[PDB]
Ligand binder design. Structure first.
Ligand SMILES: O=C(CN1CCNCC1)Nc1ccc(F)cc1
Ligand SMILES: O=C(CN1CCNCC1)Nc1ccc(F)cc1
Ligand SMILES: [Ca+2]
Ligand SMILES: [Ca+2]
Lengths: 203, 203
C-alpha cells in the first residue's frame, strides 16, 4: 500500500518527463512555423507541467531553459513583460541570461545569436522611444560594436542603418536555425515517436 | 511538406489525448488521497492541455467532465468561486449540473451522490450565514426531503441533525467510491501503462 504509492509517484515522474520533451518539441515547431496562438497555448501547458516536477536531470534543465528562452524571444518586443524578480530586466536581457546558461556548444551560431540578442535588446528600447532605458540596458550588457551602440543611443538614431544589418528578423532567422537542430534531436523522444507510429499505422 | 505538417498535427492530437487520460488518472488519485496541492497543480495541467485540444471523442468529453466535476467538489465550500457564466451558480450546483450530463450508468451510487450534492449545496450556504442564498439555491435545485430542507432554511437551523446524517464527509466518501471505479478503468491507459512498465523494469 505504501510501496505501491511510491511506485505510482515514480511512474508519474516518468510520464511528466515524457510530457516535458513532447511540449518542448511542439513549442519549438510552433516557434519555427510562426504559429503564435499554438505557441501561446503550448507554453501554458509546458509551464504547468514544469510546476508538477521536482528533481530534474541535466537534460531536463536544458529542455526547460530552451522553453524559457523561446518564451522571452517571442515576447522580446513586449517591454511591459517582467520575466525576472528584478523588474528592470527586459525580455531580451532575460533571453541573453538563459542563452549563456544552457549547457550547449559555443559554435559560430551560438555567438552570432548572442550578439544579435545584445544589439536588439538596445534597438527595441530605441524603437519605443525609451532612450534612457536603452542606455541602462547598454550598461548592464556591455570595443568596436560597443562604441557604435553608445553613439547610436546618444544620437537617438532609432532607425539607424546598423539595426538594419543586425535586425530583429535576422535574430529570429538565426534562432530558427538553432530551433531546427533542437527539433531534430528531440524528434525521437518517446511520446512523439509513439504518436507518430499510431498516425502512420492508420494511413 | 504540407502533408508532413498534417501528420505532425495529427500526432500532436494523439499525444494530447494520451496526456488528458494521464492527468485525469493523477487528478482522481490526488482527490482520493486528499493530496490538495498535487490536485491543484494537476488541475492546472489538465486545464491547459484541454485548451490545446479541439475535436473530442465521447470518451474524451466524459474524461473532461470528470475532471471538471472533481474540481467543483474540491471547491464546494468556496462560495467566492464562479464556475459558470451565470454568477449566481454555486460550485456544488455546478458539480450537480455536470453529474447529470456525464454519459454514465445511473446506479444506486449515482443517485446517492446526486442527493448528497443537493443537500450539501444548501448546507454550505447555511454554514456561512448565507440564509437568503440557501433559499435561492433551493429554488434552483428543487417531496419529503424537499419539505424538510425548506423548513431547515426558514428556521435558520445551520447545524441541523439532517445535515449530520447527509454530511459533507458522507458526500466526499461516496464520491471517492466512484473515483475508485474511474481509477480502475483508466489504470490501463497508454501513458500510465508505459511509465509503469519502466518503473517496474528498474526494480
Ligand atoms: O519563464 C518562466 C518563469 N521562471 C523563469 C526564471 N525566472 C522567473 C521564473 N518559466 C517558464 C517555463 C516554461 C515556459 F515554457 C515558459 C516559462
Ligand atoms: O472548469 C472548467 C471551465 N469550464 C467549465 C464549464 N463552464 C465554464 C468553463 N474547466 C476545467 C477543465 C479541467 C479541469 F481540471 C478543471 C476545470
Ligand atoms: Ca518595462
Ligand atoms: Ca458567491
Amino acid at each position: 500500500e505504501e510501496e505501491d504509492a511510491g511506485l505510482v509517484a515514480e511512474a508519474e515522474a516518468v510520464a511528466a518527463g515524457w510530457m516535458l520533451d513532447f511540449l518542448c518539441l511542439s513549442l519549438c515547431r510552433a516557434f519555427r512555423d510562426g504559429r503564435s496562438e499554438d505557441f501561446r497555448r503550448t507554453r501554458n501547458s509546458a509551464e504547468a507541467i514544469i510546476h508538477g516536477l521536482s528533481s530534474l536531470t541535466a537534460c531536463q534543465l536544458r529542455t526547460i531553459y530552451i522553453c524559457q528562452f523561446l518564451t522571452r524571444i517571442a515576447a522580446g518586443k513586449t517591454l511591459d513583460a517582467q520575466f525576472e524578480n528584478d523588474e528592470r530586466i527586459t525580455p531580451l536581457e532575460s533571453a541573453l541570461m538563459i542563452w549563456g546558461s544552457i549547457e550547449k556548444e559555443h559554435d559560430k551560431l551560438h555567438e552570432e545569436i548572442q550578439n544579435l540578442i545584445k544589439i536588439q535588446a538596445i534597438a527595441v528600447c530605441m524603437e519605443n522611444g525609451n532612450f534612457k532605458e536603452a542606455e541602462e540596458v547598454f550598461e548592464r550588457i556591455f570595443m568596436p560594436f560597443k562604441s557604435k551602440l553608445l553613439m547610436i543611443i546618444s544620437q537617438k538614431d532609432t532607425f539607424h542603418s546598423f539595426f538594419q544589418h543586425f535586425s530583429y528578423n535576422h535574430m529570429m532567422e538565426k534562432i530558427k536555425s538553432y530551433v531546427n537542430y533542437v527539433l531534430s534531436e528531440k524528434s525521437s523522444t518517446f511520446l512523439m515517436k509513439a504518436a507518430a507510429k499510431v498516425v502512420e499505422s492508420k494511413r
